[PDB]
């Protein structure tokens, strides 16, 4: 009995409420307001240039033929309430499949106030496109995008708004890092303009700016070419007898590198220019194929020109050394000031 | 003044046969298509197909939903979508495609006056392409897309490209990272079928691969491999051991180097523009070993010989390459 | 190298229109965001207005709903509308392009450059 005052309220409000009928429809424009608490920041993929993220959206939105009076001030109902009435079609402009999660129920809620405002919450999982310019792999940085707003209603009809400071409207979670060889520095909130073929429509953005790690290239591919080079260049110490010996430290760094330079690209898109990592493969390339051609020159003046070939021995042992390490000066230094 | 929107959009859903289509058992009724591309991407050679994202809106005139006394262009929820007819517009190659429902389903519903609509869904497709490979990598590619009518054939629909050569747009802002959208077309027809002639529009894109991946990739390694067994003509011919690891190591990985190329392509039966020039470097650096055998082996009788063939051996195998890069790269550019 | 050369401007009285555009060379900047930045003499650099691949554009206040940025992307090449011009409007206007990193709105995130179009409102 009790419940009965609270069931003919919902019934009465829902009385002639067309649904189809946007609020202040030829009237007014309907603004919903707006804020993103993000639960997870979700794993960063380079091959599909793409990135995840769960978020509990949130928007809220004037309908004054919901306003009632009663018992209570607030009705946090049923999220089947949501479906009978009007709600705005927010769509991500970016997005590639989104998930809207329904287990056990259907994650959202709906609660109406007194004087006809709405909240309505849902929980999604968002996969936005995020274009990436890898030519500074792996020591690159990247501002992955979150544009939303209208499918169907321009600018003149339905416009957003952030609930607060555009800077604190959108939040993001102290545990929810799911980010493996991304470092999250922070997001900026803004908000812009679209014109389609169909009219004008308000853009809601949002952008991450995400900074890789170099740690794992630091020990998966950097460590693997200086060893390579500096495993081929101990073959300058061998007494220039052991032809055998020198020739298997030339040809099998020689093959090493190949290797390496092959298995560099894996993670990545297939991209048309040469990133940062391509220099320094390409680089110690030339330094194991270089210490190889000085072999050959050393066996060639040998038993014609020992004195010669003593002589180029001697300096090898200092210019190939000197010249990898003060390319190494150059090389750190030129890209981790950026 | 909202009241009477409600009581106009409830009178025309009123009796409204949704089983029929707009002039059934007349003229024609006729629809024109708008494309607004949002992305293109996964073109893959292994399935053989290219994904899609886009904007697809129709346009169409339906007397029963004429209405008067509004000066407005009633954008409705997409749910009356479910109410009105639609046309039944399909893609013959498509392998899987969806409409985008979050928050709700990607949709538009738009009437006018003069009983105008305007339907506009968000969808992602997977399209199906047969590409000819025998040039990869440097190859060019057409994959279409193809819009039809599913049941009315040409006696109950039309299909034109609203706006001409302009009516799809978005493929200037596309950003391939392996190809370059070189040409986009537009194509009306009829399509004859065993149940009857259908009209159909065709949306083509001709993509032309860029090189410069391959390069880093495959060329490069194969010719740094080939000049390393030319190393081998500057070893003196009585250091067979130096000359022969020399020799295995260079032969032994021009085949894995192929064989690891292969493993991410599909499993055509022809020979590609970049199996020549891996077969054109195995014979090199093959060869080059082969070339040594016989220095070992004349270099006791005849030592004289034997110096002779390594000094000749030092110009001719650099020409010889250079000579297969010329006849190579201008015939497959 | 790449370079971007901005055309247009010059001197106009009291309102009226002035569309200043730039040509962009020796980079495809299709991928990036084209923006317009102005510097009074001796105030500050600026931000007006830029665009992104998605076509969504951003304005700054002062100017919101006076000029109006465009791109042409088969050209490389971004224009900016300037409408109902002032006298406080009289200044330097730079193109620049980048990939908005830490803000679009931060003449630090873009790494290209312009060499600035002077426009006069003489009233």
């Known amino acids: 009995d009790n419940t009965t005052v609270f069931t003919r309220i919902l019934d009465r409000l829902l009385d002639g409420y067309d649904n189809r009928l946007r609020p202040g429809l030829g009237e007014r424009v309907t603004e919903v307001k707006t804020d993103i608490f993000v639960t997870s920041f979700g794993p960063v993929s380079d091959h599909d240039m793409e990135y995840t993220i769960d978020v509990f959206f949130r928007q809220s939105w004037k309908d004054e033929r919901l306003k009632f009076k009663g018992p209570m001030t607030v009705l946090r109902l049923n999220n089947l309430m949501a479906s009978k009435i009007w709600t705005p079609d927010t769509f991500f402009h970016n997005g590639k499949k989104s998930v809207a999660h329904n287990m056990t129920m259907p994650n959202k809620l709906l609660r109406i106030t007194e004087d006809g405002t709405l909240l309505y919450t849902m929980r999604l999982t968002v996969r936005a496109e995020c274009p990436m310019h890898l030519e500074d792999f792996p020591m690159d940085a990247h501002a992955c995008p979150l544009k939303f707003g209208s499918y169907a209603y321009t600018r003149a009809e339905v416009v957003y708004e952030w609930t607060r400071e555009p800077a604190r409207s959108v939040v993001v979670a102290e545990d929810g890092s799911r980010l493996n060889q991304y470092d999250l520095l922070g997001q900026t909130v803004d908000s812009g303009i679209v014109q389609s073929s169909t009219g004008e429509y308000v853009v809601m953005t949002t952008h991450f700016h995400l900074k890789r790690k170099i740690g794992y290239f630091v020990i998966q591919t950097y460590l693997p070419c200086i060893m390579t080079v500096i495993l081929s260049q101990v073959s300058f110490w061998l007494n220039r007898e052991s032809v055998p010996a020198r020739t298997v430290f030339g040809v099998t760094t020689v093959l090493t590198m190949t290797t390496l330079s092959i298995s560099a690209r894996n993670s990545l898109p297939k991209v048309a220019y040469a990133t940062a990592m391509d220099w320094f493969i390409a680089v110690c390339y030339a330094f194991v194929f270089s210490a190889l051609i000085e072999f050959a020159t050393v066996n060639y003046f040998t038993k014609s020109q020992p004195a010669r070939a003593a002589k180029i021995d001697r300096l090898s042992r200092i210019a190939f050394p000197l010249l990898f390490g003060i390319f190494n000066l150059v090389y750190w230094a030129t890209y981790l000031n950026r | 003044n909202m009241s009477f929107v409600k009581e106009t959009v409830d009178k025309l859903l009123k009796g409204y046969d949704i089983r029929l289509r707009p002039d059934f058992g007349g003229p024609p009724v006729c629809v024109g298509m708008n494309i607004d591309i949002a992305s293109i991407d996964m073109v893959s050679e292994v399935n053989m197909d290219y994904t899609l994202t886009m904007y697809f809106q129709q346009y169409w005139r339906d007397k029963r939903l004429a209405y008067s006394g509004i000066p407005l262009n009633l954008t409705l929820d997409n749910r009356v979508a479910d109410q009105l007819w639609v046309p039944d517009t399909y893609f013959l190659n498509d392998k899987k495609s969806f409409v985008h429902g979050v928050t709700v389903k990607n949709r538009m519903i738009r009437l006018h006056p003069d009983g105008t609509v305007l339907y506009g869904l968000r969808i992602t497709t997977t399209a199906a392409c047969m590409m000819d490979l025998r040039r990869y990598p440097l190859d060019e590619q057409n994959c279409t897309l193809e819009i039809e009518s599913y049941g009315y054939t040409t006696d109950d629909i039309e299909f034109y490209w609203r706006g001409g050569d302009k009516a799809v747009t978005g493929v200037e802002r596309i950003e391939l990272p392996q190809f370059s959208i070189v040409e986009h077309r537009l194509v009306s027809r009829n399509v004859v079928f065993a149940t009857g002639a259908y009209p159909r529009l065709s949306l083509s894109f001709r993509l032309k691969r860029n090189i410069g991946y391959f390069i880093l990739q495959t060329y490069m390694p194969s010719i740094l491999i080939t000049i390393l067994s030319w190393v081998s003509f500057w070893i003196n011919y009585d250091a067979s051991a130096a000359r022969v690891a020399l020799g295995i190591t260079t032969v032994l990985t021009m085949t894995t180097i192929n064989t690891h190329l292969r493993e991410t392509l599909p499993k055509i039966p022809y020979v590609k523009a970049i199996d020549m020039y891996l077969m054109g470097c195995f014979v090199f650096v093959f060869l080059a070993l082969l070339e040594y055998a016989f220095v070992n082996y004349i270099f006791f009788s005849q030592p004289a010989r034997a110096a002779a063939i390594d000094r000749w051996s030092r110009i001719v195998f650099p020409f010889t390459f250079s000579l297969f890069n010329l006849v190579y790269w201008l015939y497959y550019v | 190298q790449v370079q971007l050369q901005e055309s247009g401007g010059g001197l106009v009285q009291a309102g009226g229109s002035l569309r200043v555009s730039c040509a962009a060379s020796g980079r495809t900047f299709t991928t990036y965001i084209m923006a317009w930045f102005r510097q009074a003499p001796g105030k500050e650099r600026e931000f007006l207005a830029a665009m992104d691949q998605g076509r969504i554009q951003y304005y700054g206040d002062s100017v919101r709903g006076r000029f109006t940025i465009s791109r042409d992307y088969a050209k490389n090449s971004v224009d900016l509308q300037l409408d109902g011009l002032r006298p406080e409007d009289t200044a330097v206007y730079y193109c620049?392009?980048?990939?908005?990193?830490?803000?679009?709105?931060?003449?630090?995130?873009?790494?290209?450059w312009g060499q600035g179009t002077q426009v006069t409102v003489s009233s």
């Open positions: 620049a392009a980048g990939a908005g990193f830490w803000g679009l709105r931060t003449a630090s995130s873009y790494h290209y």
